[PDB]
Amino acid sequence: EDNNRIISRLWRSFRTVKEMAADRGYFISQEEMDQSLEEFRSKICDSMGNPQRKLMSFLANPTPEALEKYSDLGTLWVEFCDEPSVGIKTMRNFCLRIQEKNFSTGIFIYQNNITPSANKMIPTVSPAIIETFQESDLVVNITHHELVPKHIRLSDGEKSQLLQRYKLKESQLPRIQREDPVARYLGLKRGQVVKIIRRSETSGRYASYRICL
Amino acid sequence: IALDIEKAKVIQSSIEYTTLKNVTSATEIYYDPDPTSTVIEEDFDTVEAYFSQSPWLLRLELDRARMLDKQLTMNQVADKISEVFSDDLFVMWSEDNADKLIIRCRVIEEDQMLKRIEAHMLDLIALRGIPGISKVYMVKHKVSVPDESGEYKNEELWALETDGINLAEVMAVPGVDSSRTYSNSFVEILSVLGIEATRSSLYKEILNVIAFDGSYVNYRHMALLVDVMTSRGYLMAITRHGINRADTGALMRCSFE
Amino acid sequence: ELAILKEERTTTPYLTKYERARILGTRALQISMNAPVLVDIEGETDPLQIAMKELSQRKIPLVIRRYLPDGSYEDWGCDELIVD
Amino acid sequence: ALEDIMVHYDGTTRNSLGDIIQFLYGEDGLDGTQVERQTIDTIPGSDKAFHKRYYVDLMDEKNSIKPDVIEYAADILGDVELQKELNSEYEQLVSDRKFLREIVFVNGDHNWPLPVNLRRIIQNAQQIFHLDRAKASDLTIPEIIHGVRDLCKKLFVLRGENELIKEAQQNATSLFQCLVRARLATRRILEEFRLNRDAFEWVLGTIEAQFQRSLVHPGEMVGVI
Amino acid sequence: EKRLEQEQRRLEEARKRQEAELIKRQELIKQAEEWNKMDI
Numbered sequence: 126e127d128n129n130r131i132i133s134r135l136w137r138s139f140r141t142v143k144e145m146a147a148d149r150g151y152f153i154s155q156e157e158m159d160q161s162l163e164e165f166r167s168k169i170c171d172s173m174g175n176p177q178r179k180l181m182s183f184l185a186n187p188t189p190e191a192l193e194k195y196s197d198l199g200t201l202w203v204e205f206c207d208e209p210s211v212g213i214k215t216m217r218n219f220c221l222r223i224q225e226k227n228f229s230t231g232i233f234i235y236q237n238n239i240t241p242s243a244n245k246m247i248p249t250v251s252p253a254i255i256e257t258f259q260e261s262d263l264v265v266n267i268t269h270h271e272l273v274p275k276h277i278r279l280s281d282g283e284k285s286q287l288l289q290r291y292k293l294k295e296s297q298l299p300r301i302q303r304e305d306p307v308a309r310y311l312g313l314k315r316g317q318v319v320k321i322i323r324r325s326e327t328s329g330r331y332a333s334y335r336i337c338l
Numbered sequence: 339i340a341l342d343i344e345k346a347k348v349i350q351s352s353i354e355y356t357t358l359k360n361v362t363s364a365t366e367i368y369y370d371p372d373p374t375s376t377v378i379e380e381d382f383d384t385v386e387a388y389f390s391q392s393p394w395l396l397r398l399e400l401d402r403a404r405m406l407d408k409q410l411t412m413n414q415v416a417d418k419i420s421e422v423f424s425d426d427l428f429v430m431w432s433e434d435n436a437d438k439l440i441i442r443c444r445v446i447e448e449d450q451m452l453k454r455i456e457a458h459m460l461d462l463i464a465l466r467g468i469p470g471i472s473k474v475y476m477v478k479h480k481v482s483v484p485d486e487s488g489e490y491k492n493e494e495l496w497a498l499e500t501d502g503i504n505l506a507e508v509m510a511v512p513g514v515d516s517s518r519t520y521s522n523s524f525v526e527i528l529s530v531l532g533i534e535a536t537r538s539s540l541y542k543e544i545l546n547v548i549a550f551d552g553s554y555v556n557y558r559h560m561a562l563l564v565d566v567m568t569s570r571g572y573l574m575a576i577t578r579h580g581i582n583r584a585d586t587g588a589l590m591r592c593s594f595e
Numbered sequence: 596e597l598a599i600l601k602e603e604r605t606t607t608p609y610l611t612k613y614e615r616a617r618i619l620g621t622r623a624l625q626i627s628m629n630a631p632v633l634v635d636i637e638g639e640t641d642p643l644q645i646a647m648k649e650l651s652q653r654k655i656p657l658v659i660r661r662y663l664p665d666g667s668y669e670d671w672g673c674d675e676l677i678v679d
Numbered sequence: 680a681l682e683d684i685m686v687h688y689d690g691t692t693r694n695s696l697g698d699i700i701q702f703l704y705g706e707d708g709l710d711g712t713q714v715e716r717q718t719i720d721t722i723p724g725s726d727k728a729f730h731k732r733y734y735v736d737l738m739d740e741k742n743s744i745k746p747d748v749i750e751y752a753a754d755i756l757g758d759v760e761l762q763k764e765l766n767s768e769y770e771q772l773v774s775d776r777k778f779l780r781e782i783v784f785v786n787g788d789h790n791w792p793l794p795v796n797l798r799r800i801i802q803n804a805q806q807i808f809h810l811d812r813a814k815a816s817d818l819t820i821p822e823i824i825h826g827v828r829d830l831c832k833k834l835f836v837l838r839g840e841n842e843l844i845k846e847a848q849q850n851a852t853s854l855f856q857c858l859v860r861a862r863l864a865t866r867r868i869l870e871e872f873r874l875n876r877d878a879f880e881w882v883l884g885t886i887e888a889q890f891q892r893s894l895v896h897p898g899e900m901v902g903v904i
Numbered sequence: 905e906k907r908l909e910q911e912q913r914r915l916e917e918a919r920k921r922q923e924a925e926l927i928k929r930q931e932l933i934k935q936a937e938e939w940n941k942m943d944i
Contacts, residue, residue, distance in 0.1 A: 184936045265516045270531055306532050307531075327705055327709070332846070487727065559711070561705060566680065605839045607897070611898060614898075
């Protein structure tokens with residue numbers, strides 16, 4: 126029934142979040158990646174089948190490759206919120222939890238909407254980074270779409286080499302918005318460059334670069 | 339699902355937007371002071387069989403033909419009304435074997451209030467489907483796929499084409515290939531899939547416009563155009579509001595408009 | 596500073612059509628203004644034809660300065676650029 | 680909107696502000712007038728046809744190069760190093776087939792505009808050097824392999840020794856290198872075209888020169904065009 | 905056969921790396937489960 130479809134959508138969102146965390150450089154166990162729907166219902170659903178979002182929160186650490194390539198990659202905390210609507214209190218306590226456990230990055234997935242007051246305190250959570258996603262837009266992994274090529278975030282040395290090769294200034298590169306869906310998927314921060322390798326019907330393969338804003 | 343017509347029809351029914359107004363044939367308001375009985379002799383049998391607040395009775399007759407065509411259930415409609423109105427309205431519905439499919443309602447000077455509530459009911463009661471998708475069509479697509487021997491052979495598959503756009507919601511419907519859903523409104527593509535997908539969609543639309551009459555324009559020209567339109571991170575329209583809002587020289591900008 | 600050393604020149608080693616046209620025009624104008632001619636003239640009288648004859652033999656005494664977008668430039672002699 | 684866009688001397692396509700529109704004009708750096716519809720031969724056909732056309736076996740006699748087309752057919756069978764070279768060539772061809780069939784052209788279309796017409800070059804060579812008659816070729820297989828391999832590294836679109844420059848240069852000629860390797864395979868050269876040595880160096884030089892001539896000229900006002 | 909042996913060596917190396925990373929991952933899983941129990 127509707128409980129089954131709600132559970133299925135929640136499972137798909139969980140899988141998408143795990144894939145996103147894997148793409149950004151953190152380590153997710155292969156068994157956890159293929160964690161099927163029946164196992165999800167077994168672990169989350171209660172006797173009446175209702176799910177607990179509090180049991181889905183997990184932690185991840187960067188792989189040695191990602192840590193070597195990106196030196197700013199810390200620990201990641203992903204938490205799903207039980208409250209359908211999130212306010213200043215919930216965001217404040219999430220910020221407290223992040224600060225007390227010195228997580229570098231925290232992803233907070235809510236259900237329906239976020240109040241503007243809660244949006245106001247996101248930029249003041251320094252040095253930790255808090256990113257919020259809605260449950261509805263995480264059901265489908267957009268980076269698996271046909272029209273979406275592969276985006277790879279460039280390290281600082283690679284960005285310097287690029288700017289030296291083209292004799293450029295950062296304002297002269299093509300831009301990508303900070304609220305762009307792929308930019309939020311990759312957790313792009315202002316001033317970072319993504320390399321996009323793209324299909325081309327004149328040369329086969331074409332590599333383009335964009336800078337965040 | 340692509341190679342089976344029945345499952346495709348099931349998906350098409352599940353996607354298309356259907357409201358109460360679509361199946362409702364007529365609506366009426368009656369005065370009936372007895373909640374446990376009725377004045378209308380035609381509906382007396384059904385209400386008495388069911389039985390075995392305000393007096394203002396609000397009833398409406400559903401077209402049986404379209405109700406069957408939309409593959410809907412009277413219980414489903416009643417459940418939707420109950421969910422959208424909690425327990426503020428007592429609802430009874432005739433059985434499917436009745437001569438005319440009817441559903442009755444009661445409130446638990448109110449004639450104008452009842453009329454407003456009836457208008458709201460006909461307005462925003464959503465039965466099933468993705469909002470904004472007015473119509474859905476079944477379309478057969480010919481795709482060339484390599485065979486088991488490596489040879490390319492044509493193949494026919496079923497796909498849906500809609501009227502109206504809701505990309506994010508339709509992409510999430512189970513049974514839909516979410517990795518290939520496409521829209522002809524690249525503003526929604528920008529809002530959903532990013533800027534590179536917008537570039538590809540914009541090129542596809544431009545090529546579709548140009549090549550409809552058999553004309554051919556080299557790829558590099560359209561590539562340059564769509565790279566100019568999407569170089570700032572957002573769609574830059576070819577108008578004064580797009581071109582003149584750049585950082586180019588004032589003398590260059592003033593020569594246009 | 597802005598000049599690029601001869602060892603690190605990365606532009607094309609060929610004379611583009613715009614450079615060829617501009618070089619021919621400038622050389623023809625200079626010849627029409629009584630500049631010395633660096634090739635032997637058999638019976639030719641048109642300044643443009645003399646300029647083309649000079650170009651074919653790699654005898655034009657002009658230098659192309661190719662401006663990179665950042666402001667730096669490369670100086671190429673017309674005697675070291677390949678002409679089709 | 681498009682007036683102030685021009686191809687610069689480093690290959691990029693920039694506006695008057697210097698902002699990059701494209702990192703390489705047309706994503707291949709070629710001129711619009713110097714391209715023609717050509718067929719890439721590794722895309723179409725079944726796996727059996729591809730194997731029959733391109734595979735060369737030096738151990739099995741009936742699956743080898745015909746003896747009447749080459750002078751040195753006696754001392755070819757049983758060689759293992761030359762078989763290693765042929766296997767490397769065939770693996771490169773299979774990789775090209777996979778790349779074209781699964782990434783670039785998923786629908787299998789194989790007629791695309793590409794620079795320098797190879798068919799015209801080959802038939803010009805055949806007419807120039809009188810490549811008719813049942814005469815046996817003197818073109819050794821290692822010469823074919825090394826010549827094509829070296830040619831696929833002299834198609835300069837971008838000059839420079841920078842690693843990023845080399846990567847961009849390799850990217851810019853992927854489709855064209857696939858075309859060249861599809862046409863100038865060992866079996867096709869020795870059997871279908873029957874080129875000799877001199878025809879082979881002539882073809883290689885002509886391909887390189889025509890490719891250099893088909894590039895875009897810095898100073899094009901490609902936006903207005 | 906030489907190519908097969910090299911392939912087997914690389915596969916074994918990858919298996920060892922995956923085992924080590926799983927061993928590291930289980931500690932984080934345990935910490936996360938304990939903290940989620942604390943929140944409840």
